[PDB]
Scaffold this motif. Sequence first.
Motif, PDB file in Angstrom:
ATOM      1  N   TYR A  57     -26.146  67.603  43.393  1.00 39.01           N
ATOM      2  CA  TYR A  57     -25.821  66.233  43.383  1.00 39.01           C
ATOM      3  C   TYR A  57     -24.474  65.899  43.656  1.00 39.01           C
ATOM      4  CZ  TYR A  57     -30.513  65.698  41.327  1.00 39.01           C
ATOM      5  OH  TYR A  57     -32.150  65.711  41.109  1.00 39.01           O
ATOM      6  N   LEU A  58     -23.610  66.658  43.594  1.00 34.49           N
ATOM      7  CA  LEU A  58     -22.034  66.545  43.638  1.00 34.49           C
ATOM      8  C   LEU A  58     -21.380  67.196  44.813  1.00 34.49           C
ATOM      9  CD1 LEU A  58     -20.930  66.617  39.845  1.00 34.49           C
ATOM     10  CD2 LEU A  58     -22.048  64.468  40.978  1.00 34.49           C
ATOM     11  N   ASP A  59     -22.319  68.026  45.571  1.00 37.34           N
ATOM     12  CA  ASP A  59     -21.730  68.852  46.457  1.00 37.34           C
ATOM     13  C   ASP A  59     -20.521  69.670  46.296  1.00 37.34           C
ATOM     14  OD1 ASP A  59     -22.311  70.049  49.133  1.00 37.34           O
ATOM     15  OD2 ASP A  59     -20.937  68.617  49.973  1.00 37.34           O
ATOM     16  N   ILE A  60     -20.576  70.141  44.926  1.00 41.16           N
ATOM     17  CA  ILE A  60     -19.746  71.309  44.554  1.00 41.16           C
ATOM     18  C   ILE A  60     -20.508  72.517  44.450  1.00 41.16           C
ATOM     19  CG2 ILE A  60     -18.079  71.978  42.549  1.00 41.16           C
ATOM     20  CD1 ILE A  60     -18.225  68.976  41.647  1.00 41.16           C
ATOM     21  N   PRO A  61     -19.839  73.508  45.274  1.00 41.98           N
ATOM     22  CA  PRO A  61     -20.523  74.707  45.419  1.00 41.98           C
ATOM     23  C   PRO A  61     -20.430  75.435  44.098  1.00 41.98           C
ATOM     24  CG  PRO A  61     -19.615  74.211  47.457  1.00 41.98           C
ATOM     25  CD  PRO A  61     -18.995  73.162  46.713  1.00 41.98           C
ATOM     26  N   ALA A 112      -9.430  81.067  37.693  1.00 44.93           N
ATOM     27  CA  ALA A 112     -10.854  80.559  38.117  1.00 44.93           C
ATOM     28  C   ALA A 112     -11.493  79.382  37.419  1.00 44.93           C
ATOM     29  CB  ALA A 112     -12.114  81.971  37.658  1.00 44.93           C
ATOM     30  N   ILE A 113     -11.307  79.016  36.107  1.00 50.71           N
ATOM     31  CA  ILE A 113     -11.909  77.819  35.491  1.00 50.71           C
ATOM     32  C   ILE A 113     -11.327  76.541  36.173  1.00 50.71           C
ATOM     33  CG2 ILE A 113     -12.628  76.672  33.434  1.00 50.71           C
ATOM     34  CD1 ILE A 113     -13.098  79.458  32.278  1.00 50.71           C
ATOM     35  N   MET A 114      -9.899  76.540  36.101  1.00 52.94           N
ATOM     36  CA  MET A 114      -9.112  75.683  36.631  1.00 52.94           C
ATOM     37  C   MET A 114      -9.543  75.239  38.226  1.00 52.94           C
ATOM     38  SD  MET A 114      -5.096  75.480  35.403  1.00 52.94           S
ATOM     39  CE  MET A 114      -5.005  77.204  35.399  1.00 52.94           C
ATOM     40  N   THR A 115      -9.692  76.150  39.020  1.00 51.41           N
ATOM     41  CA  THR A 115     -10.090  76.171  40.374  1.00 51.41           C
ATOM     42  C   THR A 115     -11.401  75.255  40.389  1.00 51.41           C
ATOM     43  OG1 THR A 115      -9.008  78.285  41.087  1.00 51.41           O
ATOM     44  CG2 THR A 115     -10.956  77.360  42.396  1.00 51.41           C
ATOM     45  N   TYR A 116     -12.287  75.503  39.673  1.00 48.68           N
ATOM     46  CA  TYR A 116     -13.640  75.019  39.587  1.00 48.68           C
ATOM     47  C   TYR A 116     -13.616  73.584  39.168  1.00 48.68           C
ATOM     48  CZ  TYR A 116     -18.880  74.769  39.079  1.00 48.68           C
ATOM     49  OH  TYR A 116     -20.313  74.423  38.906  1.00 48.68           O
ATOM     50  N   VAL A 117     -13.007  73.472  37.884  1.00 48.23           N
ATOM     51  CA  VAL A 117     -12.878  72.184  37.248  1.00 48.23           C
ATOM     52  C   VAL A 117     -12.156  71.294  38.236  1.00 48.23           C
ATOM     53  CG1 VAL A 117     -11.700  70.955  35.424  1.00 48.23           C
ATOM     54  CG2 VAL A 117     -12.895  72.909  34.810  1.00 48.23           C
ATOM     55  N   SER A 118     -11.183  71.651  38.798  1.00 41.68           N
ATOM     56  CA  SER A 118     -10.459  70.800  39.872  1.00 41.68           C
ATOM     57  C   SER A 118     -11.431  70.169  40.853  1.00 41.68           C
ATOM     58  CB  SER A 118      -9.116  71.517  40.519  1.00 41.68           C
ATOM     59  OG  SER A 118      -9.591  72.425  41.720  1.00 41.68           O
ATOM     60  N   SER A 119     -12.549  70.851  41.179  1.00 40.77           N
ATOM     61  CA  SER A 119     -13.205  70.309  42.295  1.00 40.77           C
ATOM     62  C   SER A 119     -14.138  69.145  41.590  1.00 40.77           C
ATOM     63  CB  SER A 119     -14.333  71.314  42.589  1.00 40.77           C
ATOM     64  OG  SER A 119     -13.585  72.167  43.544  1.00 40.77           O
ATOM     65  N   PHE A 120     -14.262  69.240  40.330  1.00 41.29           N
ATOM     66  CA  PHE A 120     -15.064  68.435  39.619  1.00 41.29           C
ATOM     67  C   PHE A 120     -14.072  67.010  39.482  1.00 41.29           C
ATOM     68  CE2 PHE A 120     -18.872  69.674  37.837  1.00 41.29           C
ATOM     69  CZ  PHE A 120     -18.805  70.986  37.894  1.00 41.29           C
ATOM     70  N   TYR A 121     -12.898  67.099  39.146  1.00 39.07           N
ATOM     71  CA  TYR A 121     -11.722  66.078  39.239  1.00 39.07           C
ATOM     72  C   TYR A 121     -11.786  65.429  40.593  1.00 39.07           C
ATOM     73  CZ  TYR A 121      -7.681  63.481  39.177  1.00 39.07           C
ATOM     74  OH  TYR A 121      -6.676  62.180  39.295  1.00 39.07           O
TER      75      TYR A 121
END
Length: 227
Positions: A190-194, A212-221
């Motif tokens: 739904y958010l097109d975040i792979p 790694a977690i910051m990288t992913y979370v930044s895509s949510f931001y």
Amino acid sequence: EFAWEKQQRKTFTAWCNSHLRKAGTQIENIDEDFRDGLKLMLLLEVISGERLPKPERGKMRVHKINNVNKALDFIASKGVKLVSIGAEEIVDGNAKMTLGMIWTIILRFAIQDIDVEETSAKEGLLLWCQRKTAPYKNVNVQNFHISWKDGLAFNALIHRHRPELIEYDKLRKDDPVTNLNNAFEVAEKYLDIPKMLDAEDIVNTARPDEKAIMTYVSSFYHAFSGA
């Protein structure tokens, strides 16, 4: 390969691909696929929206060195003083230096310009997480590692913005694999975040890798910063 290295390899590869898809390509092996500089230059063009100099496609070592130096010069032009990254070693395949270079890029082009309540960069990203997850009593975001292990924080971040996508109160703290996969799959669909994290790696590591977690979370931001 240590735990941190495996996590960074997988997550940074996935992040790079989330951008390179916009230019009709992908990498598969982060230890090999930036050695000629071509996809590194393309990555930089996608994430900045800017044109870099024409690459050399001749496939000799000099051409690859020149390409990687174009990428590094571009990064430096955005106010980054590079440390311990050199074109020859990237071309010749230094795995840890390659991960450090990709982290440098993520930090500069995905995290540094975050501005939340007069707080910048990783500190601002953390504050945003803490503000958005404040209502969720079974979440306590204190860091970019252990706080994310049980999967509830990822679900809460989504639910805060898109409550129709997450049945939050059905989630159990004692079922982290389910929670993590739920968030990852909702974000992908739904958010097109792979997907950039593997649930198994998160539950099995005492302290998951915070880059790694910051990288992913930044895509949510970035998916949500205009709410």
